[PDB]
Amino acid sequence: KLSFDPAELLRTSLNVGDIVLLKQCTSELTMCVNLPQSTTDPRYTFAKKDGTLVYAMKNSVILRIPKPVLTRQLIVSFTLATFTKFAWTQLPIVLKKLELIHRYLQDSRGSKHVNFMSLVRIIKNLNIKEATDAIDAYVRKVIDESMSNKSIDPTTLLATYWGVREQQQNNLWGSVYTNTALLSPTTVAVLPLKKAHLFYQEVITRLESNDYQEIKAFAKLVNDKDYHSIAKRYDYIRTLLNDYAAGNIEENAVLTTIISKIFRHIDMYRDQDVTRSLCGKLLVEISPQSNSSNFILGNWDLNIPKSGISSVEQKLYDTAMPTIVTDRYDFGDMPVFCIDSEDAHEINDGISIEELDGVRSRIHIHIADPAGLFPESFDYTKSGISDDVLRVSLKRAFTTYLPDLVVPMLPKSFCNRADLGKHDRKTETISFSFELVNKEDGGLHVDYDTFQVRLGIVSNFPKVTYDKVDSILNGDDNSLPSKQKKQLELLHTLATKLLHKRIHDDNAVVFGDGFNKGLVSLSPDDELCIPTFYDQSQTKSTLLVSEFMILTNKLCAAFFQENKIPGVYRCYNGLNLGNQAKAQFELLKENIKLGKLPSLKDITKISSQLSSSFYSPFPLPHKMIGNTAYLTVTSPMRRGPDLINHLQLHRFLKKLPLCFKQEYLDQYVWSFQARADILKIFQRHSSTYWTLKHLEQSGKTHDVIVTSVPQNGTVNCLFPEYSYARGTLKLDPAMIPRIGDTIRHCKVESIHPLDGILTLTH
RNA sequence: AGAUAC
Ligand SMILES: [Mg+2]
């Protein structure tokens, strides 16, 4: 065991024996020595080289290496020491490689990510002496050769991480993202030498010369409120403030000091902690009157198009057209229900039912077929991907949905063509058909032998929204044909039994009330700048739609496995938990069978025992949805995993050579999981920004629920009324509260929206 | 933190 397989990360959860890097101890190795014991305290116990323990949140783990009292302490310590030693020895050599291959990976035009693993492999497999010979070809040989085994050397891994954190300080690499489920790094940006490293070197130089004269000249202009000259003269400083508020340079400490000096020289801002919000306030103050300014949108990793690389790609997307334009089953005038919101972009799904008997119904799930618009759907002559629009699409591994804006994974042209829901238009689908039988027990049974996958056509699309459907199933609405209206009631009654089945039979875990309140929508102004809040609805139509997609996705799992097809699955492992905690958890899991579903107060206590879901190149149980594999196909225009599962289908159904061998898959799943993580983050970050910006506009008291153990006399908390208003409370020393506890009257200390900071007193 | 849709 000198190397390990990245796959054991997916197969395993955090467990004792794991060797970790913590956010606390980024420069010392640690090792998990105990798991959480209760809901009262859900932290893991880690041991340092010194035998000193550390208790930390599962998510404080930045990277993970999978697996007589004194002997145990001794072997724990000597192990950690050995790994550190061999790690340190490589490090001066690794820094040299990092600077070097940074020359080959960099793109001159903007930030560009790379799989962190692929990167580690290059570090290991590279000879500096051969790379410097006047016969480059070598380096490119090592990079392509990174694809093979796929095993990874832990010490090189550790050293590379350390090397990157070091060269991060020179604006050579972006942040290292650590996936929540695997607890391991996924990707890191490679920032351009001239546009970021070098630019900020010249900035620092020009600002410190003649004892910070230009800092001084600038701060004067600000105090004299002459914003005009700032524009002509000091735009490089606006840039700097911008890169701080957006979160691009928040890790370069020189620049933070520079910024401290500037605030120190400005009257209003002089005494205040240097926070992105504060850079935002200033930058707003010295820039022409806007209506809103979400600066998170400037973030390089969020990677919205602004000049750059993505600005190049959208120049293609704007003029791209799916001229790839044949043996499909036609469903005729059979009606297809596309139950989406009024404010929807991509219509990926439709439902059709045929009532055959009182006992039996046949179901058709018509998924848009974006895979069809590309030569790769059918072309067995060329292995891999030749197409521009397709490579780009897979790079934007999902559509980016934010309260501010949306960035579709696919071009507008391809979306109009592939979209469902266009009435009386012959519309290509991929359709999954099967039959359900009502069972004697009142239950329901699914005939997998009915299950069928076909390339179809549909054209009869009833106009429907989750609301219209709901008012229909209440009787409020009767604008629909009685034949159509009854297919809905039938579908709704089928889902109810599907859901009841998933709970009692698949031991699925399904959430109750309160879980998605105060979500964020922008409203426009006298410009989308007004936040309005809502709850995600759990209704008859959502229940209907959801139950079927879940089922569709479960079945393609079965299909891909039985036919030995490489697919992108979505998995969920859960946590390794202490025996007393596993009972606190299990006690809640029987409550869902019995009829009570968990409250968010109840979930807060449980939330300290949950994992997150992750994509995988091979089947693993998604242990929430049920006890079985799960492969997402229902949203091929907005999820890359689904989109890839479709190209495999096109190949298979036309009995062609498949598009992807299993090896090409692991590379993409890494690419996808990376982009998935970034998006979860920036979704939370922006909505938080807006939750807080509203709490600012609204003006001192609110009720909260405790969500953490006191660390330095302070707890984490959340607002029941708002999902993205998470803060910290300074506990009153006069008295300690448990997790899930409510505190009704609380004083607001500070609010920093661009930073996500919310502070309170009791 | 799970799920669906977007
Ligand atoms: Mg829909």
mmCIF file of C-alpha atoms in Angstrom, chain A residues 253-394:
data_model
loop_
_atom_site.group_PDB
_atom_site.id
_atom_site.type_symbol
_atom_site.label_atom_id
_atom_site.label_comp_id
_atom_site.label_asym_id
_atom_site.label_seq_id
_atom_site.Cartn_x
_atom_site.Cartn_y
_atom_site.Cartn_z
ATOM 1 C CA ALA A 253 -2.407 38.399 2.185
ATOM 2 C CA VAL A 254 -0.268 41.150 0.716
ATOM 3 C CA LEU A 255 -3.304 42.423 -1.101
ATOM 4 C CA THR A 256 -5.297 42.282 2.089
ATOM 5 C CA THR A 257 -2.680 44.411 3.800
ATOM 6 C CA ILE A 258 -2.686 46.854 0.906
ATOM 7 C CA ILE A 259 -6.435 47.059 1.287
ATOM 8 C CA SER A 260 -6.131 47.535 5.051
ATOM 9 C CA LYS A 261 -3.817 50.501 4.450
ATOM 10 C CA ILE A 262 -6.272 52.050 2.019
ATOM 11 C CA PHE A 263 -9.207 51.766 4.381
ATOM 12 C CA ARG A 264 -6.974 53.102 7.122
ATOM 13 C CA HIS A 265 -6.476 56.199 5.002
ATOM 14 C CA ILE A 266 -10.209 56.795 4.355
ATOM 15 C CA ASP A 267 -12.267 58.579 6.998
ATOM 16 C CA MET A 268 -15.531 56.708 6.878
ATOM 17 C CA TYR A 269 -13.959 53.304 6.559
ATOM 18 C CA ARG A 270 -10.963 53.877 8.726
ATOM 19 C CA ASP A 271 -11.629 51.854 11.893
ATOM 20 C CA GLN A 272 -13.632 48.940 10.419
ATOM 21 C CA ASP A 273 -12.798 45.297 9.752
ATOM 22 C CA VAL A 274 -11.719 44.634 6.191
ATOM 23 C CA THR A 275 -14.557 42.589 4.695
ATOM 24 C CA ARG A 276 -15.793 41.998 1.188
ATOM 25 C CA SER A 277 -18.932 43.958 2.086
ATOM 26 C CA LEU A 278 -16.684 46.824 2.925
ATOM 27 C CA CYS A 279 -14.881 46.591 -0.399
ATOM 28 C CA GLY A 280 -18.310 46.415 -1.976
ATOM 29 C CA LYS A 281 -19.555 49.544 -0.220
ATOM 30 C CA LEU A 282 -16.501 51.437 -1.314
ATOM 31 C CA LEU A 283 -16.424 50.101 -4.834
ATOM 32 C CA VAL A 284 -20.094 50.962 -5.128
ATOM 33 C CA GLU A 285 -19.287 54.412 -3.862
ATOM 34 C CA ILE A 286 -16.630 55.062 -6.500
ATOM 35 C CA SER A 287 -18.466 53.556 -9.517
ATOM 36 C CA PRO A 288 -21.282 55.010 -11.614
ATOM 37 C CA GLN A 289 -24.786 54.817 -10.157
ATOM 38 C CA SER A 290 -26.027 51.246 -10.498
ATOM 39 C CA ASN A 291 -29.345 49.840 -9.288
ATOM 40 C CA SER A 292 -27.921 46.588 -7.879
ATOM 41 C CA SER A 293 -24.462 45.222 -7.640
ATOM 42 C CA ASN A 294 -23.982 41.610 -6.898
ATOM 43 C CA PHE A 295 -20.242 41.309 -7.068
ATOM 44 C CA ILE A 296 -20.196 37.552 -6.494
ATOM 45 C CA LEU A 297 -20.988 37.523 -10.179
ATOM 46 C CA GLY A 298 -17.410 38.585 -10.750
ATOM 47 C CA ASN A 299 -16.045 35.394 -9.254
ATOM 48 C CA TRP A 300 -13.663 33.540 -11.564
ATOM 49 C CA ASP A 301 -14.674 30.070 -10.423
ATOM 50 C CA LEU A 302 -18.377 30.809 -10.781
ATOM 51 C CA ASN A 303 -17.113 31.521 -14.263
ATOM 52 C CA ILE A 304 -19.950 33.569 -15.778
ATOM 53 C CA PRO A 305 -19.095 35.160 -19.147
ATOM 54 C CA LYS A 306 -17.928 38.746 -18.859
ATOM 55 C CA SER A 307 -13.410 39.234 -22.055
ATOM 56 C CA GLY A 308 -11.992 35.832 -21.169
ATOM 57 C CA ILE A 309 -12.448 32.213 -22.202
ATOM 58 C CA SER A 310 -16.185 31.920 -21.568
ATOM 59 C CA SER A 311 -16.652 35.131 -23.550
ATOM 60 C CA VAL A 312 -14.989 33.317 -26.448
ATOM 61 C CA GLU A 313 -17.289 30.324 -26.065
ATOM 62 C CA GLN A 314 -20.491 32.358 -25.998
ATOM 63 C CA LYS A 315 -19.387 33.954 -29.256
ATOM 64 C CA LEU A 316 -19.736 30.402 -30.578
ATOM 65 C CA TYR A 317 -22.975 29.671 -28.729
ATOM 66 C CA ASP A 318 -24.649 32.778 -30.078
ATOM 67 C CA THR A 319 -24.003 31.717 -33.670
ATOM 68 C CA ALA A 320 -24.186 27.949 -33.214
ATOM 69 C CA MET A 321 -27.018 25.958 -34.819
ATOM 70 C CA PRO A 322 -27.757 22.202 -34.549
ATOM 71 C CA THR A 323 -27.655 21.415 -38.258
ATOM 72 C CA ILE A 324 -27.227 17.732 -37.386
ATOM 73 C CA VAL A 325 -30.666 16.544 -38.649
ATOM 74 C CA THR A 326 -34.642 9.471 -38.127
ATOM 75 C CA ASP A 327 -36.365 6.119 -37.147
ATOM 76 C CA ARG A 328 -38.559 7.068 -34.196
ATOM 77 C CA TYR A 329 -41.804 5.667 -32.774
ATOM 78 C CA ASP A 330 -44.694 8.163 -33.075
ATOM 79 C CA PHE A 331 -47.152 8.533 -30.183
ATOM 80 C CA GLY A 332 -49.419 10.624 -32.367
ATOM 81 C CA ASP A 333 -51.937 12.818 -30.640
ATOM 82 C CA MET A 334 -51.504 11.142 -27.329
ATOM 83 C CA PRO A 335 -51.365 14.000 -24.830
ATOM 84 C CA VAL A 336 -48.140 14.795 -23.007
ATOM 85 C CA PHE A 337 -48.153 16.742 -19.749
ATOM 86 C CA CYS A 338 -45.195 19.123 -19.156
ATOM 87 C CA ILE A 339 -45.763 20.340 -15.601
ATOM 88 C CA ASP A 340 -43.298 23.197 -15.101
ATOM 89 C CA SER A 341 -43.531 26.686 -13.585
ATOM 90 C CA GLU A 342 -44.540 29.797 -15.477
ATOM 91 C CA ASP A 343 -40.947 31.066 -15.112
ATOM 92 C CA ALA A 344 -39.213 27.969 -16.618
ATOM 93 C CA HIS A 345 -36.390 27.789 -19.156
ATOM 94 C CA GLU A 346 -35.735 24.212 -20.264
ATOM 95 C CA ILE A 347 -38.572 21.721 -20.527
ATOM 96 C CA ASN A 348 -36.908 18.296 -20.188
ATOM 97 C CA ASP A 349 -39.886 16.136 -19.181
ATOM 98 C CA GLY A 350 -43.419 15.091 -20.076
ATOM 99 C CA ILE A 351 -45.805 12.437 -18.761
ATOM 100 C CA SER A 352 -48.379 10.334 -20.604
ATOM 101 C CA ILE A 353 -50.700 7.667 -19.223
ATOM 102 C CA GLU A 354 -52.874 5.043 -20.851
ATOM 103 C CA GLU A 355 -55.493 3.439 -18.678
ATOM 104 C CA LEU A 356 -55.642 -0.101 -20.062
ATOM 105 C CA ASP A 357 -57.735 -1.723 -17.327
ATOM 106 C CA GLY A 358 -58.952 -0.816 -13.877
ATOM 107 C CA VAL A 359 -55.993 -2.821 -12.593
ATOM 108 C CA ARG A 360 -53.297 -1.703 -15.069
ATOM 109 C CA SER A 361 -51.985 1.593 -16.496
ATOM 110 C CA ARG A 362 -49.234 2.234 -19.015
ATOM 111 C CA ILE A 363 -46.898 5.161 -18.492
ATOM 112 C CA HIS A 364 -44.737 7.097 -20.908
ATOM 113 C CA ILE A 365 -42.039 9.500 -19.831
ATOM 114 C CA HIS A 366 -40.888 11.612 -22.704
ATOM 115 C CA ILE A 367 -37.567 13.264 -22.147
ATOM 116 C CA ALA A 368 -36.313 15.906 -24.523
ATOM 117 C CA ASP A 369 -33.568 14.510 -26.762
ATOM 118 C CA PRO A 370 -30.752 17.015 -26.893
ATOM 119 C CA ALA A 371 -28.317 14.149 -27.484
ATOM 120 C CA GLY A 372 -29.779 13.927 -30.996
ATOM 121 C CA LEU A 373 -28.565 17.301 -32.250
ATOM 122 C CA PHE A 374 -24.935 16.117 -32.306
ATOM 123 C CA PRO A 375 -23.079 13.816 -34.728
ATOM 124 C CA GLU A 376 -21.726 11.949 -31.722
ATOM 125 C CA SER A 377 -25.153 10.388 -31.130
ATOM 126 C CA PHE A 378 -24.657 8.090 -34.108
ATOM 127 C CA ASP A 379 -21.078 8.370 -35.435
ATOM 128 C CA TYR A 380 -19.058 5.186 -34.753
ATOM 129 C CA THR A 381 -16.304 6.305 -37.150
ATOM 130 C CA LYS A 382 -14.694 8.730 -34.646
ATOM 131 C CA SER A 383 -14.037 7.648 -31.059
ATOM 132 C CA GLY A 384 -14.484 10.312 -28.412
ATOM 133 C CA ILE A 385 -15.938 13.794 -28.997
ATOM 134 C CA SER A 386 -15.120 15.914 -32.045
ATOM 135 C CA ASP A 387 -17.816 18.585 -31.641
ATOM 136 C CA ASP A 388 -17.221 22.088 -30.312
ATOM 137 C CA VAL A 389 -20.653 22.784 -28.900
ATOM 138 C CA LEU A 390 -20.629 19.428 -27.225
ATOM 139 C CA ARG A 391 -17.202 19.782 -25.623
ATOM 140 C CA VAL A 392 -18.187 23.204 -24.344
ATOM 141 C CA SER A 393 -21.489 21.932 -23.030
ATOM 142 C CA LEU A 394 -19.852 19.155 -21.073
#
